Amino acid sequence: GITPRFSITQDEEFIFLKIFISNIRFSAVGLEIIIQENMIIFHLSPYYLRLRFPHELIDDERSTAQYDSKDECINVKVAKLNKNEYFEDLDLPTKLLARQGDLAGADALTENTDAKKTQKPLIQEVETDGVSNN
Structure with a gap:
């Protein structure tokens, strides 16, 4: 990830990611x-940045980013899959970058799973070859 400063915010409808940049x-x-x-x-x-949240977001028509000159910052909007949902990683920057470091240091991670699940299985079928004669 490349950038001077960037802060992410969570809402009860969507996610609001703010990025700080010069002119x-x-x-x-x-x-x-x-x-x-x-x-x-x-x-x-x-500068390329990679954000990895413990949840799953979606890119729809509502999703979009607006450039702010008054503050020379960038605003990124993205809809979520579940309303009234929050995050527990946005609080930490590294939690988003998901770097590896120098493989030296006491570090741990704890991500919770989603409650809402979908079950839509399916069984495919296709003919096969085979005769009856000797």
Whole structure:
């Protein structure tokens, strides 16, 4: 992850990620933030950032980011899969980067699983070869 400063906020409807940046070369052709199956990928700006939350988000039409000049900061919006839901990793920066470090130091992680689950199995079928003659 590359960036001077960035803070994430959680809401009872969606997630609000804020990024701090200077008034340096800010192109408008490379700007395009995309959200993965669950985690969020920050491609905007010349600096790439990777956010990994303990939950799963979704990228819909509502999802979008707006550039703030008054503060020279960037605002990223992303809808969640469950309303009234929060996070327990946004509090820590490393928890988002998910770095490895120097494999030296007492560190631990505790992520909770989701309650709402979906069960939609399926059994495929296809003919087969075989004769009856000797």
